[PDB]
A paper describes a structure:
HA is a class I viral fusion protein that facilitates viral entry by interacting with sialic acid receptors on the host cell and then fusing the viral and cell membranes in acidic endosomal compartments. HA is expressed as a precursor form termed HA0, which is then cleaved by host-cell proteases into HA1 and HA2 domains, resulting in a trimer of heterodimers. In this study, we structurally characterized one such bnAb, H7.5, which targets a unique semioccluded yet highly conserved region on the HA head. We found that H7.5 binds to an epitope only accessible through transient “breathing” of the HA head, and this observation provides insight into the conformational transitions necessary for viral fusion as well as key information about a unique vaccine target.
Intriguingly, the H7.5 antibody was found to simultaneously interact with two separated surfaces on two adjacent HA protomers. Moreover, our model illustrated that the epitope recognized by H7.5 is not completely accessible when all three HA1 heads are close together, as observed in the apo cleaved H7 trimer crystal structure. Interestingly, the heavy-chain framework region 3 (H-FR3) of H7.5 was juxtaposed to the RBS of an adjacent HA protomer, and in a closed-trimer model, CDRH3 of H7.5 would clash with residues 189 to 194 in the 190 helix of the adjacent protomer. Indeed, further interface analysis revealed that the HA surface interacting with CDRH2 and CDRL3 of H7.5 (surface 1) generates a total buried surface area of 720 Å2, with substantial favorable energy estimated to be −5 kcal/mol and an extensive hydrogen bond network between H7.5 and the HA in surface 1. In contrast, the surface between the adjacent HA protomer and H-FR3 of H7.5 (surface 2) is significantly smaller (only 240 Å2) and appears to be energetically unfavorable with a ΔG (change in Gibbs free energy) of +1.2 kcal/mol. Binding of all three Fabs ultimately results in a conformation of HA with the heads splayed apart.
Numbering used by the authors:
A (entry chain A): 227 to 236, 245 to 270, 270A, 270B, 271 to 275, 279 to 291, 291A, 292 to 343
B (entry chain C), D (entry chain D), E (entry chain J): 7 to 174
C (entry chain A): 26 to 118
The structure:
């Protein structure tokens, strides 16, 4: 890819590349090039959550969302349509009651 | 002098406890194995649902910033449409599980009617409300016999013949 | 003289469910499969998160002054916040 | 001399009308309550479907103009895929409702076979085609008895014994 | 001296072959029509599934090149989400077909229990494991009678009365 700066507004445009092992990244500079001093390597599958909630050192859970966390043993949630990590599905049905027994044939005749 | 019918009773002794209307004034519950059979299947329903929903998710939308609105409209539309698809699937699946749970409850009770009928053959008259009218001196021992599956018309029919037989 | 009556564990008025035949059928015993409990704090029982605060996630590759301490890190969780930014001087990726 | 069988009859008097083959030449229909029970559930099937489809929609595509083709291809693909998903859901749901309707019809008729069997006990021989052979003088009054649920082997069995009994 | 029970037998002669435990040492299989009825429905299950999946597809993604990543992320997300939707639909549909196949197998066998019961009326005692205890000299000819639907209590009951009757 080739690039050229366009004068008329102060801005730094960052561009990125994932360089394969044993390959060589070649750069050609004619100016307006902000060079990296260091590169980056990835280590161990993080979960990038975007949220306003405070941290808690006793709380444990997999589901994170902008308003907090979802800790449950249930397949569905009504809390947020945007979740991170392994989670229950978002539905518009605020109350999906699943019977765990027989119907209530009324106690009084 | 209650007209004993389906043992609604406000029963606390098991989900499928059956009332034994002993003339001596008893109300003992059924063999736990019937209830246990229901428990063995129903309690696992939650886990079956979990395995169908517990998936890895990642952020597509940058909530604290802005994405090109034309794409964002496609994503919002897509997510909303998928939400309705999954909501439909969820309602349908839950409804299926609820209907199946009811069907199971009716099926298990049906099996219990069969247990009485196949063992007594003639002296078990079904009232359609869960009740069998028994034509012999069916005291607590017969309840034990039912629960222990020693209930058998080979002897019990004769005991009822003393109370029911008509020869003509 | 004696009866065998199959009970349905009919407790005092309970709750209702939606089925394939009718909606709002009252049932003795049920559980909700949709939880609405929102825990307003972030769980950290694992490799504790990089709480970027004023630092944005991309900032960790660039090094805004608020990101200087987060230039090299490891965790199973990364937290971004509304006040966070990836730049000090205007830019984009 | 028809071989009266399942009362197909080109019947107009209710969905679940039953033919009473009175030797005197009658063809009266069944208690409307059986038909009504079917009506009470089947007529509501449409409304159950409506509640699952009646949703607010807005235009995404500007039909009289043009949207970037790359996005338009995604939208068309998405809509088409969703159309197949909803078409599948629609066919499946309708098929489920159709199968359930058939199952309901068979279940209700099954209950009506039971109504006859439980009340007569011995003189109701099922032909497997909806017909019961009755072993007593079952004139219009017995049809009224069935519809009024006064049909009872306590008296009717004896009436049949006059026509059926064998002692040995 | 085997305790002949449900004819698991490692049977090769048809899916629904029934063991006839002739005291003379026979193990002949059932009327093929029962098996054929299962075949007529089950073999078509694959075709029913095919008609719901066989659709025209075109390339959206240029696999050997690159598409704008933002759109590609939407497409990959959409396809993956749809894959889960279709995988769910596939698992559910297959599970429904499997449950229905099992229900069909139980239903057909249930009909075969009924065939024996309705024809013999009193001398067919069900063991709950597919076995009927027969109270008469039921040699190969009775098996032919069952398969030819000439099995009839009108004559067979009398043959059993010679072996079973009690007068009191
Ligand atoms: C990287 O290049 C070196 C050159 O000496 C080679 O030995 C090594 O195996 C290469 N690694 C891979 C993954 O090819
Ligand atoms: C997408 O939906 C969110 C709410 O879930 C809304 O804030 C956002 O503006 C929507 N995007 C567009 C482009 O309308
Ligand atoms: C019904 O289920 C709930 C589920 O949480 C349980 O707490 C309750 O005790 C059950 N009711 C009984 C067993 O009467
Ligand atoms: C999308 O489908 C419509 C017809 O429904 C067609 O007219 C339109 O050109 C399609 N869009 C693209 C980009 O092909
Ligand atoms: C889309 O998925 C394919 C693999 O199916 C992957 O190679 C491609 O890079 C993905 N597109 C993007 C933008 O990540």
């Amino acid at each position: 890819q080739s690039f050229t700066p366009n004068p008329g507004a102060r801005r730094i445009d960052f561009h990125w590349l994932l360089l394969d092992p044993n390959d060589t990244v070649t750069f050609t500079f004619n100016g307006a090039f902000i060079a990296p001093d260091r590169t980056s390597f990835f280590r161990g599958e993080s979960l990038g959550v975007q949220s306003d909630a405070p941290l808690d050192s006793s709380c444990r859970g997999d589901c994170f969302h902008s308003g907090g966390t979802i800790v449950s043993s249930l397949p569905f949630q009504n809390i947020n349509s945007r979740t991170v990590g392994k989670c229950p599905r978002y539905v518009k049905q605020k109350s999906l009651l699943l019977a765990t027994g027989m119907r209530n044939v009324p106690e009084k005749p | 002098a209650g007209f004993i019918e389906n043992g609604w009773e406000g029963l606390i002794n098991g989900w499928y406890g059956f009332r034994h209307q002993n003339a001596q004034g008893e109300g003992t519950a059924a063999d736990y194995k019937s209830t246990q059979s229901a428990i063995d299947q129903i309690t696992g329903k939650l886990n079956r649902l979990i395995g169908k929903t517990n998936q890895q998710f990642e952020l597509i939308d940058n909530e604290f910033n802005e994405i090109e609105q034309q794409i964002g409209n496609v994503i919002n539309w897509t997510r909303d449409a998928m939400t309705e698809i999954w909501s439909y699937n969820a309602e349908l699946l839950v409804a299926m599980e609820n209907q199946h749970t009811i069907d199971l409850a009716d099926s298990e009770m049906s099996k219990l009617y069969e247990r009485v009928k196949k063992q007594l053959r003639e002296n078990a008259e079904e009232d359609g409300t869960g009740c069998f009218e028994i034509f012999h001196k069916c005291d607590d021992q017969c309840m034990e016999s039912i629960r222990n599956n020693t209930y058998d018309h080979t002897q019990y029919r004769t005991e009822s013949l003393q109370n029911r037989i008509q020869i003509d | 003289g004696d009866k065998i009556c199959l009970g349905h564990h009919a407790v005092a008025n309970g709750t209702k469910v939606n089925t394939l035949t009718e909606r709002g059928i009252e049932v003795v015993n049920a559980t909700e499969t949709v939880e609405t409990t929102n825990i307003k704090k972030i769980c950290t029982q694992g490799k504790r998160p990089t709480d970027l605060g004023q630092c944005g996630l991309l900032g960790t590759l660039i090094g805004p002054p608020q990101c200087d301490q987060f230039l090299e890190f490891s965790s199973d969780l990364i937290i971004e916040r509304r006040e966070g930014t990836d730049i000090c001087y205007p830019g984009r990726f």
